[PDB]
Design a binder for this molecule. Sequence first.
Ligand SMILES: N[C@@H](CCC(=O)N[C@@H](CS)C(=O)NCC(=O)O)C(=O)O
Ligand SMILES: [Mg+2]
Length: 93
Amino acid sequence: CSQIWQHPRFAAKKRSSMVKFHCYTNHSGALTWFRKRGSQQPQELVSEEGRIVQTQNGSVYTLTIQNIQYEDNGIYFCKQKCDSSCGTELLVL
Ligand SMILES: N[C@@H](CCC(=O)N[C@@H](CS)C(=O)NCC(=O)O)C(=O)O
Ligand SMILES: [Mg+2]
């Protein structure tokens, strides 16, 4: 990873299960999660009525994806929320 570290780097989960990813950096500023499918443009994650939740646990930013399904396949990464690259791959089994 670069200036932003993510854990895990790979997760494989059966449909309907839950996953939690974590990211942090040594700089100040909130991080926000994005999802990338293939080489497409990254898109900011939306809550989907609480199915996908971003929280902050001190210095660590956590993404929780519940009831995992096909649309969740992809590469997840954190970026500085407001800004004056490693990722986490999710494979749905
Ligand atoms: N409370 C706002 C956050 C606003 C904010 O911090 N905006 C940043 C950009 S990410 C900024 O510097 N905006 C400059 C301005 O409003 O003049 C929200 O959740 O939308
Ligand atoms: Mg990979």
